[PDB]
Design a protein around this ligand. Structure first.
Ligand SMILES: CNC(=O)c1ccccc1OC1CCOCC1
Length: 114
């Protein structure tokens, strides 16, 4: 509350650490379904069903232009990529499996870093 704060956490390295995690995400061999926005003109149903599309290149642009006020907002967009993937793809599919793998890969790097 007012004039009552927890000991101040060093958040000066968060931006660079999130960039590092995103670079690791972008270079994983199963990152290919998430590198660029899903093409809404070429994929029927996607624009209608997925209300908040998200991909690694949009995340990179947002991170690089100061559009993440904190750690949590970055993690929400990364998780949104995989929540969208689960909504539109069968678990038993290459993209469906790519999503589950990339999520597990992200969550470990996220716990280990922060
Ligand atoms: C994350 N991608 C999808 O949920 C997706 C769903 C149906 C059809 C195509 C899709 O993504 C393409 C992205 C570019 O590479 C090939 C798949």
């Amino acid at each position: 509350s007012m004039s009552v704060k927890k000991p101040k956490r060093d958040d000066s390295k968060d931006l660079a650490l999130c960039s590092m995690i995103l670079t690791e995400m972008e270079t994983h061999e199963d990152a290919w379904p998430f590198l660029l926005p899903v093409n809404l003109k070429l994929v029927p149903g996607y624009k209608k069903v997925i209300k908040k599309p998200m991909d690694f290149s949009t995340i990179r642009e947002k991170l690089s232009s100061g559009q993440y006020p904190n750690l949590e907002t970055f993690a929400l967009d990364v998780r949104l990529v995989f929540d969208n993937c689960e909504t539109f793809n069968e678990d038993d599919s290459d993209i469906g499996r790519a999503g589950h793998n990339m999520r597990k890969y992200f969550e470990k790097k996220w716990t280990d870093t922060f």
